[PDB]
Write an enzyme that holds these catalytic residues in place. Structure first.
Site, PDB file in Angstrom:
ATOM      1  N   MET A 178       0.785  -1.231   0.000  1.00 42.34           N
ATOM      2  CA  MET A 178       0.000   0.000   0.000  1.00 42.34           C
ATOM      3  C   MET A 178       0.822   1.289   0.000  1.00 42.34           C
ATOM      4  O   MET A 178       0.608   2.162  -0.842  1.00 42.34           O
ATOM      5  CB  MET A 178      -0.979   0.004   1.180  1.00 42.34           C
ATOM      6  CG  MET A 178      -1.894   1.220   1.196  1.00 42.34           C
ATOM      7  SD  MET A 178      -3.246   1.024   2.352  1.00 42.34           S
ATOM      8  CE  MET A 178      -2.366   1.131   3.897  1.00 42.34           C
ATOM      9  N   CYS A 194       3.598   9.180  10.899  1.00 41.18           N
ATOM     10  CA  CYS A 194       2.508   9.900  10.261  1.00 41.18           C
ATOM     11  C   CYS A 194       1.942  11.016  11.137  1.00 41.18           C
ATOM     12  O   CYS A 194       1.716  12.127  10.660  1.00 41.18           O
ATOM     13  CB  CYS A 194       1.401   8.924   9.868  1.00 41.18           C
ATOM     14  SG  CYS A 194       0.912   7.821  11.207  1.00 41.18           S
ATOM     15  N   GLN A 243      -6.922   8.918  14.495  1.00 41.17           N
ATOM     16  CA  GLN A 243      -6.175   8.229  13.447  1.00 41.17           C
ATOM     17  C   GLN A 243      -6.887   7.196  12.585  1.00 41.17           C
ATOM     18  O   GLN A 243      -7.612   6.335  13.081  1.00 41.17           O
ATOM     19  CB  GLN A 243      -4.920   7.611  14.061  1.00 41.17           C
ATOM     20  CG  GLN A 243      -3.953   8.664  14.574  1.00 41.17           C
ATOM     21  CD  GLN A 243      -2.730   8.074  15.238  1.00 41.17           C
ATOM     22  OE1 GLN A 243      -2.001   7.274  14.641  1.00 41.17           O
ATOM     23  NE2 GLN A 243      -2.487   8.474  16.481  1.00 41.17           N
ATOM     24  N   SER A 299      -5.657   3.227   7.783  1.00 36.77           N
ATOM     25  CA  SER A 299      -4.525   2.991   6.890  1.00 36.77           C
ATOM     26  C   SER A 299      -3.221   2.892   7.686  1.00 36.77           C
ATOM     27  O   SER A 299      -2.274   2.229   7.261  1.00 36.77           O
ATOM     28  CB  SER A 299      -4.424   4.104   5.840  1.00 36.77           C
ATOM     29  OG  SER A 299      -4.268   5.379   6.443  1.00 36.77           O
ATOM     30  N   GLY A 335      -2.858   1.312  10.244  1.00 34.04           N
ATOM     31  CA  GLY A 335      -2.761  -0.073  10.656  1.00 34.04           C
ATOM     32  C   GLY A 335      -2.368  -0.902   9.448  1.00 34.04           C
ATOM     33  O   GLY A 335      -1.484  -1.757   9.527  1.00 34.04           O
ATOM     34  N   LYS A 355       6.402   8.524  20.289  1.00 31.90           N
ATOM     35  CA  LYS A 355       7.036   9.072  19.092  1.00 31.90           C
ATOM     36  C   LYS A 355       6.813  10.572  18.939  1.00 31.90           C
ATOM     37  O   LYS A 355       7.592  11.257  18.279  1.00 31.90           O
ATOM     38  CB  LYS A 355       6.528   8.347  17.841  1.00 31.90           C
ATOM     39  CG  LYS A 355       7.030   6.920  17.724  1.00 31.90           C
ATOM     40  CD  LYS A 355       6.446   6.217  16.509  1.00 31.90           C
ATOM     41  CE  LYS A 355       6.935   4.783  16.420  1.00 31.90           C
ATOM     42  NZ  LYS A 355       6.279   4.051  15.300  1.00 31.90           N
ATOM     43  N   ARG A 407      -7.369   5.385  17.645  1.00 32.30           N
ATOM     44  CA  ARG A 407      -7.718   4.873  16.320  1.00 32.30           C
ATOM     45  C   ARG A 407      -9.218   5.097  16.127  1.00 32.30           C
ATOM     46  O   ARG A 407     -10.013   4.770  17.011  1.00 32.30           O
ATOM     47  CB  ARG A 407      -7.414   3.373  16.221  1.00 32.30           C
ATOM     48  CG  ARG A 407      -7.609   2.782  14.820  1.00 32.30           C
ATOM     49  CD  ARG A 407      -6.533   3.274  13.857  1.00 32.30           C
ATOM     50  NE  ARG A 407      -5.221   2.730  14.205  1.00 32.30           N
ATOM     51  CZ  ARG A 407      -4.060   3.191  13.746  1.00 32.30           C
ATOM     52  NH1 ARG A 407      -4.024   4.219  12.906  1.00 32.30           N
ATOM     53  NH2 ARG A 407      -2.928   2.625  14.137  1.00 32.30           N
ATOM     54  N   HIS A 409      -5.753  11.355   9.103  1.00 31.79           N
ATOM     55  CA  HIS A 409      -5.541  11.524  10.537  1.00 31.79           C
ATOM     56  C   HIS A 409      -5.985  12.943  10.863  1.00 31.79           C
ATOM     57  O   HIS A 409      -5.655  13.883  10.139  1.00 31.79           O
ATOM     58  CB  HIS A 409      -4.063  11.443  10.933  1.00 31.79           C
ATOM     59  CG  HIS A 409      -3.494  10.059  10.943  1.00 31.79           C
ATOM     60  ND1 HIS A 409      -4.266   8.926  10.813  1.00 31.79           N
ATOM     61  CD2 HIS A 409      -2.217   9.631  11.095  1.00 31.79           C
ATOM     62  CE1 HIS A 409      -3.490   7.857  10.883  1.00 31.79           C
ATOM     63  NE2 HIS A 409      -2.243   8.259  11.054  1.00 31.79           N
ATOM     64  N   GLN A 443      -2.763  10.288   5.736  1.00 36.28           N
ATOM     65  CA  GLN A 443      -1.726   9.445   6.333  1.00 36.28           C
ATOM     66  C   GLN A 443      -0.742   8.803   5.360  1.00 36.28           C
ATOM     67  O   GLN A 443       0.411   8.567   5.716  1.00 36.28           O
ATOM     68  CB  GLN A 443      -2.389   8.345   7.184  1.00 36.28           C
ATOM     69  CG  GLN A 443      -1.428   7.505   8.024  1.00 36.28           C
ATOM     70  CD  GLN A 443      -0.856   6.301   7.286  1.00 36.28           C
ATOM     71  OE1 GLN A 443       0.260   5.860   7.569  1.00 36.28           O
ATOM     72  NE2 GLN A 443      -1.623   5.755   6.354  1.00 36.28           N
TER      73      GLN A 443
END
Ligand code: NA
Ligand code: NA
Ligand code: NA
Ligand code: NA
Ligand code: NA
Lengths: 367, 367
Positions: free
Chosen positions: B12, B135, B162, B165, B167, B244, B267, B274, B350
């Site tokens: 993807m 992202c 979020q 995608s 995931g 992060k 999520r 996002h 994202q």
């Protein structure tokens, strides 16, 4: 016993109220009278325990004979009937789900597990009007009650994830119908294991912007999206939904000094549950174990979800909370900004503690 | 002409990269070589008017012959091949989408519209490993870059919304399939004008908790719900996704002092976009008009959406942003906490700035 009238009992919020009252056998402790406009003259609901008839919701004489009135009919009804009742000299109790009377000086916003003291003082001082608080604020206080009760909150910043039920019944149907449109459009591809994900997404994305999705109630698509604006725009830049945060939190708690509450209220693709993310500035550095203890001890509905991955995934979500009275709070930890900065995530059903439940409990107190 | 190898181009993220490269004609200036982890020998994508065969992604000799490697294959691949390739004496450029090497001393996290100076310095100082940032952080910086570039940020608290995608492709299909289950279960009721909303919701809610919904990828349902935990649990109570935020923001910007970044990563039921809600503490009272100007002036993708209801509903949403390179920011106003507290809501795709775009742009600089 008290003679209690019910208005708007067939609407969505009113139906949840009736459901809960039957579950708790609340009709055995009162003499209920049911009102209507399109079904007046027909038999009263059997679940009410009476062999009465549906009365005219606009018949002032029928209303004046009551000791208590519980209405889930809405602002328009309250704005017309409430004044006429009070002007007639009626001193009965008015329990309302509508926001219309919330900020009136002779009205108290009710959420007894949190502000029973305020309610009791009001009752002793002649207050006869009790109004449920905004869903967002009521759910926030039910989950974070322990922090406010112990005066540990300096200020609160929030980001909400609000359900369609807050908009209304037709809004919920619109959301579900949209889900049907999106899935149906790519049903064949999903059923094909070799199909390309980008082909599937492009089709869904294009359909969403095509104008084919029914969006009469939300104005724009909700399924697969979100809307960062709820209710009327105010001159200060807030939406009225966001404005209610500070206004109602402080009135419910009857604070001695204003506790700043602000943030962004966003509509998301959920049916009944409102989830909320918080950045809480504490008045002092209290340990997380102490925070967890205070929150859990405040009331039995503020279930503290351990800050661990799997249990959070299972208990701190709309899927786990919809239709229940639980208002769980989790993800409790100090933020990197400092030990006086607390993070928290809550979930709660908008129609129960956020709407019907406070009304049922207030009525019970007066029964 | 540089010999450039592509790993994970079929997946993807890789597919979005390929698509963007085709749109920008990025294959014309390079000599592309395509690799496979399980389909070596088969025909290679005929991009940029070239033809060939898929090479072995695990063949160090084939990899060593390249000048540049662009991989969207993932962390497991990078963790196994990168060390071996460097140890074999390869001195080429490694451009990676995986998080694996982000915090390595000899690697630079890339987001050129935000940190070109850091990238340029690294290139001159012998850095040969460039990795795209998370992202969440990349989208936050593309939207709010102006505030950081003018050193106006004291700290930032975030609540994310979020997309699936993040995931993966399977995760996106799971979300859409679930939407199909939910709607299908009550399709007849929805098509019946007189059906009761509570009967419809009851069925959807029950089905959701039944265990019938396919949840192999997310663990719990996503359609109609949300999950306030993304990635592994850390000892400080954060999820790796939340960690992060501060780690990558400070490395990307190469800050002289640590800027606290923290919050909750959730999520939600979106496909590719996002959205993020922010509470930003400014170092000084800056007017909203000035804030708007600074944000818009930082980079061409940081579209400032006026803080007005209708325009916000139409442009500050996943429905409006999916598939585009625009990283809009809106709902800009001061919070009740004080004039140094700024509210902001951002939306971004994202897969583009959050994954593939930084890689394409870095490749262009090395071609
Ligand atoms: Na009596
Ligand atoms: Na009206
Ligand atoms: Na823990
Ligand atoms: Na050369
Ligand atoms: Na304005």
């Amino acid at each position: 016993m008290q003679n209690v009238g019910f208005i708007g009992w067939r609407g969505m919020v009113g139906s949840v109220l009736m459901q809960r009252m039957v579950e708790e056998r609340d009709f055995d402790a009162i003499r209920p009278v049911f009102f209507s406009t399109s079904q007046l003259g027909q038999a009263a609901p059997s679940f009410g325990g009476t062999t009465g008839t549906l009365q005219d919701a606009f018949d002032l004489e029928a209303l004046k004979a009551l000791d208590i009135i519980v209405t889930c009919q809405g602002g328009d009804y309250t704005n017309e009937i409430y004044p006429k009742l009070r002007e007639s000299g009626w001193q009965g109790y008015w329990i309302d789900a509508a926001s219309s009377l919330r900020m009136k000086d002779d009205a108290i916003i009710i959420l007894d597990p949190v502000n029973q003291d305020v309610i009791t003082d009001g009752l002793n001082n002649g207050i006869r009007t009790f109004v449920g608080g905004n869903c967002t604020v009521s759910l926030m206080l039910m989950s974070l009650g322990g922090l406010f009760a112990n005066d540990l909150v300096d200020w609160v910043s929030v980001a909400t994830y609000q359900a369609a039920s807050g908009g209304g019944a037709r809004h919920m149907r619109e959301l579900l119908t949209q889900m049907g449109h999106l899935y149906g459009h790519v049903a064949d591809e999903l059923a094909t294991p070799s199909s390309a994900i980008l082909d599937i997404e492009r089709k869904v994305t294009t359909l969403t912007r095509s104008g084919e999705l029914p969006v009469d109630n939300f104005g724009v698509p909700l399924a697969g999206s979100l809307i960062p604006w709820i209710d009327k725009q105010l001159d200060n830049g807030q939406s009225r939904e966001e404005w209610k945060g500070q206004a109602e939190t402080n009135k419910i708690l009857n604070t001695s000094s204003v506790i700043p509450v602000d943030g962004l209220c966003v509509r998301v693709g959920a049916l009944r549950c409102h989830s909320q993310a918080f950045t809480i500035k504490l008045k002092k550095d209290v340990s997380i174990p102490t925070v967890e203890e205070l929150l859990a001890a405040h009331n039995p509905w503020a279930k503290v979800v351990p800050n661990d991955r799997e249990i959070t995934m299972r208990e701190l979500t709309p899927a786990a909370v919809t239709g229940t009275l639980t208002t769980p709070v989790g993800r409790l930890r100090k933020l990197n900004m400092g030990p006086e900065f607390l993070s928290a995530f809550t979930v709660g059903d908008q129609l129960l503690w956020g709407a019907a439940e406070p009304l049922r409990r207030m009525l019970r107190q007066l029964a």
